[PDB]
């Protein structure tokens, strides 16, 4: 069998500053005995971003991740904790097996802030923390009008092909 | 620094083919086993091709075996994917990314896009005239606009709280 990596939860509605606990399961070990390696990778993906590795060997943390971050776990079984959730980590996290072909993704973990009734919750985050939130958004809301283009150019298509025949 | 950069993305029939490119930059290129990763319209991620360093050995899942081929020039820092063969499945991002062969995929491009259209037969549209046709056009432009307009504002309408709570800061 191809190995199959399957993760949970789904998605996950989070505040901010709460721990969150995110697993995914292998189908196969992922270790090699004669390196003691788990060759497992997790990717931070924000909406209208490009995927950004986080973590490999299944536990070391690529350059700049902070160390609220951890990876843990071995073999079959693998954990990514956030100690305490911050606005910036509001992100898809995928898992990764790179031990054998055909590579292979689990469907991911989707942690998103909860909806409040106001914004008044704004005034406990820092200028910093406001600033990147505000700037995430600009990818976002980009990729959903590129779709929206992407749609009509392929309803315009057919229009455009019999104008030219 | 490193840069990956695709380009190749379109609008294709069912069927038909397409050949991305990626351009990279900031590393010894020839070094590197490189790969190809897509994600559907769902958000899934898949694989899709590894090409070893020198270029001799090609790895790909049964998905697109035997319809896409990766393939690479190292002295011109390129990394290629040519899908044939088109399905209404491969339309998806398409993202460059170095890694493969034994190791994660530590740096990744910007993606370039590959939809494949419906396949519906629109013959019937060569009975009509082109002012017809034009007129038809014409009033998809509006509609495009309308539809942007709203992601606009829905995006706006998530700016302007955070944009505010900035402003009382200081
Ligand atoms: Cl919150
Ligand atoms: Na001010």
Same mark, same amino acid.
């Given at each position: 069998?191809?190995?199959?990596?399957?993760?949970?939860?789904?998605?996950?509605?989070?505040?901010?500053?709460?721990?969150?606990?995110?697993?995914?399961?292998?189908?196969?070990?992922?270790?090699?005995?004669?390196?003691?390696?788990?060759?497992?990778?997790?990717?931070?993906?924000?909406?209208?971003?490009?995927?950004?590795?986080?973590?490999?060997?299944?536990?070391?943390?690529?350059?700049?991740?902070?160390?609220?971050?951890?990876?843990?776990?071995?073999?079959?079984?693998?954990?990514?904790?956030?100690?305490?959730?911050?606005?910036?980590?509001?992100?898809?996290?995928?898992?990764?097996?790179?031990?054998?072909?055909?590579?292979?993704?689990?469907?991911?973990?989707?942690?998103?802030?909860?909806?409040?009734?106001?914004?008044?919750?704004?005034?406990?985050?820092?200028?910093?923390?406001?600033?990147?939130?505000?700037?995430?958004?600009?990818?976002?809301?980009?990729?959903?009008?590129?779709?929206?283009?992407?749609?009509?150019?392929?309803?315009?298509?057919?229009?455009?092909?019999?104008?030219?025949? | 620094?490193?840069?990956?950069?695709?380009?190749?993305? #379109?609008?294709? =029939?069912?069927?038909?083919? +397409?050949?991305? %490119?990626?351009?990279? $930059?900031?590393? !010894?290129?020839?070094? *590197?086993?490189?790969?190809?990763?897509?994600?559907?319209?769902?958000?899934?991620?898949?694989?899709?091709?590894?090409?070893?360093?020198?270029?001799?050995?090609?790895?790909?899942?049964?998905?697109?075996?035997?319809?896409?081929?990766?393939?690479? #020039?190292?002295? =011109?820092?390129?990394?290629? +994917?040519?899908? %044939?063969?088109?399905? $209404?499945?491969? !339309?998806?991002?398409? *993202?460059?990314?170095?890694?493969?062969?034994?190791?994660?995929?530590?740096?990744?491009?910007?993606?370039?896009?590959?939809?494949?259209?419906?396949?519906?037969?629109?013959?019937?549209?060569?009975?009509?005239?082109?002012?017809?046709?034009?007129?038809?056009?014409?009033?998809?432009?509006?509609?495009?606009?309308?539809?942007?307009?709203?992601?606009?504002?829905?995006?706006?309408?998530?700016?302007?709280?955070?944009?505010?709570?900035?402003?009382?800061?200081?």
């Amino acid at each position: 069998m191809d190995i199959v990596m399957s993760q949970s939860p789904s998605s996950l509605a989070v505040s901010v500053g709460e721990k969150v606990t995110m697993s995914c399961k292998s189908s196969q070990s992922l270790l090699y005995s004669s390196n003691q390696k788990n060759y497992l990778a997790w990717y931070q993906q924000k909406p209208g971003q490009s995927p950004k590795l986080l973590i490999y060997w299944a536990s070391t943390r690529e350059s700049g991740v902070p160390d609220r971050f951890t990876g843990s776990g071995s073999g079959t079984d693998f954990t990514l904790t956030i100690s305490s959730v911050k606005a910036e980590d509001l992100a898809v996290y995928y898992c990764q097996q790179y031990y054998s072909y055909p590579y292979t993704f689990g469907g991911g973990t989707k942690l998103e802030i909860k909806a409040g009734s106001d914004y008044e919750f704004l005034k406990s985050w820092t200028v910093e923390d406001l600033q990147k939130r505000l700037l995430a958004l600009d990818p976002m809301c980009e990729q959903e009008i590129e779709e929206i283009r992407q749609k009509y150019q392929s309803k315009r298509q057919p229009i455009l092909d019999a104008i030219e025949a | 620094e490193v840069q990956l950069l695709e380009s190749g993305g #379109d609008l294709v =029939k069912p069927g038909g083919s +397409l050949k991305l %490119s990626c351009a990279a $930059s900031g590393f !010894t290129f020839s070094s *590197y086993g490189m790969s190809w990763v897509r994600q559907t319209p769902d958000k899934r991620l898949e694989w899709v091709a590894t090409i070893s360093s020198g270029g001799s050995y090609t790895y790909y899942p049964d998905s697109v075996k035997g319809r896409f081929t990766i393939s690479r #020039d190292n002295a =011109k820092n390129t990394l290629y +994917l040519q899908m %044939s063969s088109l399905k $209404s499945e491969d !339309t998806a991002m398409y *993202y460059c990314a170095r890694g493969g062969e034994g190791y994660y995929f530590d740096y990744w491009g910007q993606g370039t896009t590959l939809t494949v259209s419906s396949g519906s037969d629109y013959e019937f549209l060569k009975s009509w005239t082109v002012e017809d046709l034009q007129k038809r056009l014409l009033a998809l432009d509006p509609m495009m606009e309308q539809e942007i307009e709203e992601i606009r504002q829905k995006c706006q309408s998530k700016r302007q709280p955070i944009l505010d709570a900035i402003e009382a800061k200081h």
